[PDB]
């Protein structure tokens, strides 16, 4: 109709300078197109140099740009298709699917640089999100619309953990999942897609329960500094329109901080301390404060952290940790004892493990559990040194109870039905608190240790107790 057509005047790596003819200029953070023979090449205006001339960061490869090509404007920010048709469709940061399942017939196209919700709409009492895994909902409960730091390297069942979260949020609260790999390794991107097909959370024929956004590593840094925002907008449309409680998965937020570093070092801004960009707090806040709870619904985020060089005064974990409500560590020494999941109990601490929110009974049970496993860990050296004769009746019962609890933490998975074949037990919270409470009292001390491994609740504990009583006689 009335296009805003200008010429590319300068290509510098991932930085692109676009001249516009006069009295036409779009503001900052607006999407610009360049038509290529290979497809379209998207730019996002980030700085105005004056002279009717803007400066953008790339969103795809900037090889072969003749300076002087036409620059088409789309006015708004980077548009993304949203809604039901996006489920099970691998969308990049542009808005186009890359699974080759044809174009996505979505109903609206949303901007991604929206406003965060205003202060009158922030929900004024953070309740507990019933996730479904026992050790999560007991020890370090995930804040409903809060932020969760999931540590640990790959190969400890982290993808199994996150698919288990997908199934349990699909069952209990009925919420959908939006996964987002910022900086995701492409090969394990495909392996995650294949595994999410075979576990049933992606049905290519029925109704899948997740939207994938994979910002690959071989894109220029302006892409990775917006992929998380793409996943965030797909979360926001499911929140404020259909009214649900949606899980936004982000891996891996340190690569998002790298994307921020390299975008705001390509723009010629002076770098800060350690070498992260000086817009660190604000460009973490524009990702954090759009993940919250309004009176309509909520989006709860599980986002990983790559701790740089195993150090926690480096400002990227030291900035993420000013936002995370609850941590969850998938350690090595717990899966090494063959425990699924490997939620380590002593480390995963929440800011919402407090009696004023979870209730008095839950806080009492969790505090006794933490002190029980704490005493167990402090005894584990002299257990090997001295043996079980230096234990008094004050102490040997605590060793027995803590072995019972440590076996009892494992849970049959809704996704390890092709792994182990044991069907998964979605455990409610009101079963979980009562079950751990009864084990902390001592009403099941006669039950052997072997009948506590991979059990759902106290009822299946009783059932496995009877079955192993029958198999022993």
């Amino acid at each position: 109709s009335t296009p805003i057509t200008g010429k590319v005047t300068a290509v510098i790596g991932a930085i692109v300078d676009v001249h516009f003819e006069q009295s036409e200029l779009p503001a900052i953070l607006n999407a610009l197109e360049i038509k290529t023979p290979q497809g379209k090449l998207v730019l996002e205006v980030a700085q105005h140099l004056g002279e009717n001339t803007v400066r953008t960061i790339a969103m795809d490869g900037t090889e072969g740009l003749v300076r002087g090509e036409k620059v088409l404007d789309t006015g708004g920010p980077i548009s993304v298709p949203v809604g039901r048709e996006t489920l099970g469709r691998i969308i990049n940061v542009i808005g186009e699917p890359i699974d080759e399942r044809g174009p996505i017939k979505s109903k609206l196209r949303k901007p991604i640089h929206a406003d965060p919700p205003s202060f009158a709409e922030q929900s004024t009492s953070a309740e507990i999100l019933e996730t479904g895994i026992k050790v999560v909902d007991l020890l370090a409960p995930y804040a409903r619309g809060g932020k969760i730091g999931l540590f640990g390297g790959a190969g400890v069942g982290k993808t199994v953990f996150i698919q288990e979260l997908i199934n349990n949020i699909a069952k209990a609260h009925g919420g959908f999942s939006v996964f987002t790999g910022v900086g995701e390794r492409t090969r394990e991107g495909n392996d995650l897609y294949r595994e999410m097909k075979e576990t049933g959370v992606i049905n290519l024929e029925g109704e899948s329960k997740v939207a994938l956004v994979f910002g690959q590593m071989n894109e220029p840094p302006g892409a990775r500094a917006r992929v998380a925002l793409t996943g965030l907008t797909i979360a926001e449309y499911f929140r404020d329109e259909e009214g649900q409680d949606v899980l936004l998965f982000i891996d891996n937020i340190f690569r998002f901080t790298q994307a921020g570093s390299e975008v705001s070092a390509l723009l010629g801004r002076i770098p800060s301390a350690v070498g992260y960009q000086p817009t660190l707090a604000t460009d973490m806040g524009l990702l954090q404060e759009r993940i919250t709870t309004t009176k309509k619904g909520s989006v709860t985020s599980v986002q990983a952290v790559y701790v740089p060089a195993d150090d926690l005064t480096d400002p990227a974990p030291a900035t993420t940790f000013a936002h995370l409500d609850a941590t969850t560590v998938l350690s090595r020494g717990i899966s090494e004892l063959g425990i699924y999941p490997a939620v380590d109990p002593l480390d995963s601490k929440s800011r919402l493990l407090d009696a004023a929110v979870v209730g008095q009974e839950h806080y009492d049970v969790a505090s006794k559990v933490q002190e029980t496993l704490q005493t167990y860990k402090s005894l584990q050296d002299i257990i090997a040194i001295l043996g079980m004769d230096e234990l008094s009746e004050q102490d040997k019962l605590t060793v027995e109870r803590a072995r019972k609890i440590q076996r009892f933490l494992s849970q049959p998975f809704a996704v390890a039905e092709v792994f182990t074949g044991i069907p998964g037990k979605l455990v409610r919270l009101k079963d979980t608190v009562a079950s751990f409470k009864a084990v902390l009292e001592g009403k099941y001390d006669n039950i052997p240790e072997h009948a506590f491994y991979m059990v759902g609740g106290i009822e299946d504990v009783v059932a496995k107790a009877e079955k192993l009583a029958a198999e022993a006689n």
Binding site: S23, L25, P26, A27, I28, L29, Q47, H48, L49, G50, E51, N52, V54, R55, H113, P116, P117, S118, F119, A120, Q122, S123, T124, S125, A126, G145, G146, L267, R269, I270, P271, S272, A273, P278, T279, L280, A281, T282, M284, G285, L286, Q288, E289, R290, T292, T293, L312, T313, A318, F321, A322, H323, R351, A356
Partner: protein, 506 residues
Amino acid sequence: KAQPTEVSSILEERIKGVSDEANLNETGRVLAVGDGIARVFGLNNIQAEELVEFSSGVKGMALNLEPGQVGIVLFGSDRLVKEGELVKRTGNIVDVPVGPGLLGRVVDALGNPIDGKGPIDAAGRSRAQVKAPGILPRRSVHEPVQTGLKAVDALVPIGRGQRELIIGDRQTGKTAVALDTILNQKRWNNGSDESKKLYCVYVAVGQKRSTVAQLVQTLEQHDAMKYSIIVAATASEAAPLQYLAPFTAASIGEWFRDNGKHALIVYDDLSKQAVAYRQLSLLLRRPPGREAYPGDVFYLHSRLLERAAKLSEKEGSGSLTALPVIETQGGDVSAYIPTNVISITDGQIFLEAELFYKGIRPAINVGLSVSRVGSAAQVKALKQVAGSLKLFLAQYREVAAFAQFGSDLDASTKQTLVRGERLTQLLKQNQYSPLATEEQVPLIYAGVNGHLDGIELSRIGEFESSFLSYLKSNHNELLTEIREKGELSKELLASLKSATESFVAT
């Protein structure tokens, strides 16, 4: 109903009345917007730090002036301010609404309320950059700020006009001290005397939206919002808002200071204000200093915290007392930022992470937390019955690493070790239960004079509430004596010793 439309139509008359006199000796085009700051051509009669308004609602402060163009910093995201727009100048140095009508409201850095309770009943405007009061209208501090915590008023007392620092680490219980102090001021905010009331202005910078939402919900559960002022500069919003918001809140504090009343302010937390300031000085090419805070970042916290002291009788005996909060990195007290807040404030309350890891909340490290002009303004009673307590905890800290050897010792170190453990377990406190000084005196009094030594260590937590209810049911007149007099005479001391040894005996 249509009543806000009535009010907004009256405001339309003001806008239409302002349009009849709108001739903006100022307007200039936006040459270039970049690095989150704008360069403007024109405006040949603007002032240094004058507020301007772009054509999209984003206000701005003009912080530097050059021959040719003027550099205006933004007050929000730069998504709104477009190249080539229109820049009216407002006419003001950067001001905020001050006055008593803000009590109950939640504003951001420019007096725009965001609670949803209508416009601010504003008793006036005041500058953000006020010169601090010089050395002549100052009086050294002589009145208590009863925080209601046990260990704070035991060891590190706070005077009206004494800038005290709450330094600590991440998720180590920093905010809870300021929140308990604000909830303790309910003892006098319900009262009638003005010179004993103490208004609280809590200034959240760099924090999450939902944290400030829960904190407003907390200050309306326990009914603090008849005297609270929340200035929120949450981390979603852009950097010069966070650079500005504690200063505008200090103007709010100075309004209560000049008008005779007394008021407490809490900055929380200035280690994110220096984050916002190093963002604004690393986007204007100003070269960084030590650890990339720019070279004047001492001056920033200087010109902030120096607008808070005790005015003498010549100006009206008002006051303003500040508690900045500094987030360090792993128990450090020697980075470049926490060695500038310490070199301004009159002392530290070093909330060490290791003691909170043992659950002793609040986790005041006694041997580090000290105050410089606290001692001249404590309540007279605590100063009578805790003149040993600082020296006794120093004594117990001396034998801290000496008893880790496990060696059998003499009698005196065992006596001091038992009394020191009883005092360490004694100073614990749950959330939202500040104890008034009328009840802080007998608990510390039972701690000092060896009465606890027969009790096992676990009973002390319920000994606190048991001995308090024993004094509330029976010796109520002693609590009224400590309330009125604020001082223990000899007869009061003997009656208190009898009332201890009674309940100590069982």
